């Protein structure tokens, strides 16, 4: 569960999730799991996909998570009326736009990278795809 | 017509003196129990030298009723009091070794033949 | 002797509990011998010890024979239990057993929890909301799951402290004769060392290895 050590403010606004992504290229490794769909990605989902990728590649090659959560999601307790403040910071998500390369790996064959990324993307809410790095 | 919460006298010498029917066995929602009918009973009274004690739950079969049996010619044999023979709780064999009072022809089957050999009349 | 053995072995004698004697001696002591193979060595110390000497606290010089019981357990300090959820936590929500409010007229708040391990069943019914009954029923789930954990720890350790506590004189090992002829003898392995001072300075290693070598056969 990745989470910001010593963040500035405790809570933050909801906001929107518009636009396309920024890190749209495989830059560190050679095989990448990219996002076709929008949505949020919790730290639990990110650690679950990372555990699937590590257990699939059996601790070979390098693994890059190209997203950190850094957005506090609050939640109101239940049997509690509306108003009377703001809910407690319960989990942390990372906003994900289409085209965001979520994961990267290197040092693994391509078909085993495809299987590791399939086992990853089974555990994520958003639609993904497998992209390869390219020169220029 | 033995139903539940019905007190019965005891025909054999098994030690009980008055029992109470708590369950008419065999068939859901069953109201009554005729003569050749197994019931579940509790022992509400016993003799001190009995094989069974007061407050035990075991099995019995009726041998006499006041409502009485009806023969195929239309005859009816009404006794004076409802009596029962205390059987075993699982093997359905009588506890005692003797039988007081008469029984009917409706105890003609192998288990109740073991009963009916010991009976004085039929 | 036991601290001079533990520190020569390199172990750590922590001395959890202690109680002095009135004139001389001790009245009770409970040690913690931090070591790798600590209980594997100190299995050989279970049972009473016999000391035959002349008491310096005497005046007549009577031979004083003395008996000190030694109970030595292995410690755990495990405390490793978090949840149970891999089985079926069979829960139930029902109207609580109460009057004097709108609980009997309107809604159900009470929570029963049933476990397949050892049939732990817990009721929480008195907090005006079903959700806090689930949360406090989880707290009183752990508040007896940890208790039964201590019950099973204690039930194992009671078998440990009652393994061989029925033999008559065979529970008496380690006669430390000082006054007439000065020999230490073990009464289960039949070995003996005639220099009792080197034994009392902590060289019970031969008496432990002979014990394990006998109980291995």
């Amino acid at each position: 569960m990745l989470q910001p050590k010593r963040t500035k403010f405790r809570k933050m606004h909801k906001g929107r999730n518009r636009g396309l992504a920024q890190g749209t290229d495989v830059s560190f490794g050679s095989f990448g799991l990219k996002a076709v769909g929008r949505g949020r990605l919790t730290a639990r989902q990110i650690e679950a996909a990372r555990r699937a990728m590590t257990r699939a590649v059996k601790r070979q090659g390098k693994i890059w998570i190209r997203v950190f959560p850094d957005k506090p999601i609050t939640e109101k307790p239940l049997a509690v009326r509306m108003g009377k403040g703001k809910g407690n910071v319960e989990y942390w998500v990372a906003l994900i736009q289409p085209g965001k390369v979520l994961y990267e790996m290197d040092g693994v064959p391509e078909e085993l990278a495809r299987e590791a990324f399939k086992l990853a993307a089974a555990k994520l809410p958003i639609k993904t795809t497998f992209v390869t790095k390219t020169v220029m | 017509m033995i139903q539940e919460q019905t007190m019965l006298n005891v025909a054999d010498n098994s030690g009980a003196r008055r029992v109470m029917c708590i369950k008419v066995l065999g068939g859901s929602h069953r109201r009554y129990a005729g003569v050749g009918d197994i019931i579940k009973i509790t022992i509400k009274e016993a003799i001190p030298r009995g094989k069974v004690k007061k407050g035990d739950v075991l099995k019995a079969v009726v041998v006499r009723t006041k409502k009485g049996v009806r023969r195929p010619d239309g005859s009816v044999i009404r006794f004076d009091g409802n009596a029962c023979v205390l059987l075993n709780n699982n093997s359905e064999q009588p506890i005692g070794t003797r039988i007081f009072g008469p029984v009917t022809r409706e105890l003609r089957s192998e288990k109740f033949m073991k009963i009916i050999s010991l009976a004085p009349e039929v | 002797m036991y601290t001079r053995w533990g520190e020569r072995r390199g172990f750590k004698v922590e001395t959890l509990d202690y109680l002095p004697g009135d004139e001389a001696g001790i009245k009770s002591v409970t040690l913690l011998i931090k070591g790798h193979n600590a209980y594997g060595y100190l299995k050989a110390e279970k049972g009473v010890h016999r000391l035959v000497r002349i008491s310096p606290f005497d005046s007549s010089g009577r031979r004083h024979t003395s008996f000190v019981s030694c109970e030595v357990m292995p410690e755990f300090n495990d405390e490793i239990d978090i949840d149970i959820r891999t089985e079926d936590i069979k829960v139930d929500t029902y109207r609580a057993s109460g009057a004097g409010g709108p609980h009997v007229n309107t809604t159900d708040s009470a929570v029963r929890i049933t476990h397949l391990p050892t049939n732990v069943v817990v009721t929480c019914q008195t907090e005006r909301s079903q959700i806090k009954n689930r949360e406090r029923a989880m707290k009183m789930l752990k508040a007896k799951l940890y208790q039964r954990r201590i019950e099973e720890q204690q039930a194992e350790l009671d078998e440990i402290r009652g393994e061989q506590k029925e033999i008559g004189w065979g529970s008496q090992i380690r006669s430390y004769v000082f006054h007439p002829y000065s020999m230490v003898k073990d009464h289960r392995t039949n070995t003996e060392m005639g220099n009792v001072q080197a034994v009392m300075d902590g060289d019970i290693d031969t008496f432990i290895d002979a014990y394990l070598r006998s109980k291995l056969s």
């Binding site: - | - | 009577r62 031979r63 008996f67 402290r161 506590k165 029925e166 529970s171």
Partner: protein, 54 residues
Amino acid sequence: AKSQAKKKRGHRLRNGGRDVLLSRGSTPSFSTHGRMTKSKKEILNKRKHKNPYD
């Protein structure tokens, strides 16, 4: 009379017991008292074998 400690033990064994005497340390089958060989007073006036005087 049974002691107040034993009455508290009985109440706590009826009400969700543990039987703490199992967790008591088991005494040996013999007696562990202090054995002292006799003094010169005791041996000098023990009067054994009671042989008459001449």
